[PDB]
């Protein structure tokens, strides 16, 4: 893990697609299967990135997953969180409602 300058991207995704066992990973000739999670990732800027990462284990569905990103390999490290653990600004980014300027004068 070369720290150097980091400057790494993180896409806030939501695990909607689950249980995709890709048995195409037979390779040696066994019954071991990776899981496919292809979804729309939202970056800090506010774009829509298309990414599909395969995991050895089946991860937490319905959760908000923070996926790391770098140009030389796309994806490698990622962590599972909830909207409560994320900054409220994320809700002010996606999921904003009207009448939310409700303040006393």
């Amino acid at each position: 893990m070369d720290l150097n300058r980091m400057g790494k991207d993180e896409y806030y995704v939501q695990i909607t697609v689950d249980g995709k066992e890709v048995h195409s990973k037979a390779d040696n000739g066994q019954k071991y299967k990776d899981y496919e999670y292809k979804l729309t990732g939202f970056d800090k800027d506010g774009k829509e990135k298309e990414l599909e990462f395969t995991a050895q284990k089946n991860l937490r569905k319905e959760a908000f997953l923070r996926v790391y990103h770098s140009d030389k390999k796309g994806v490698s490290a990622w962590e599972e969180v909830k909207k409560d653990e994320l900054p409220a600004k994320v809700k002010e980014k996606l999921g904003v409602k009207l009448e939310h300027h409700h303040h006393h004068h």
Side-chain angles (χ1 to χ4, degrees), residues 13-30:
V13 311
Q14 202 289 269
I15 305 300
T16 55
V17 294
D18 175 54
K20 289 186 171 187
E21 54 170 65
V22 293
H23 199 167
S24 187
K25 275 292 187 176
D27 292 350
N28 180 270
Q30 300 178 211

Side-chain angles (χ1 to χ4, degrees), residues 38-54:
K38 181 162 183 161
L39 35 64
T40 302
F42 308 103
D43 45 83
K44 297 180 180 295
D45 300 90
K47 307 180 185 302
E48 294 180 82
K49 187 74 174 182
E50 187 189 287
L51 64 168
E52 55 285 275
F53 59 98
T54 52

Side-chain angles (χ1 to χ4, degrees), residues 17 21-22 32 34-35 38 41-42 54 57 59 63 67 79 84-85 93 99 102 105:
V17 294
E21 54 170 65
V22 293
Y32 63 89
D34 293 37
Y35 298 89
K38 181 162 183 161
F42 308 103
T54 52
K57 295 186 58 188
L59 49 79
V67 182
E79 297 186 81
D84 312 83
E85 300 169 278
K93 184 66 177 181
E99 184 178 76
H102 178 267
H105 184 266

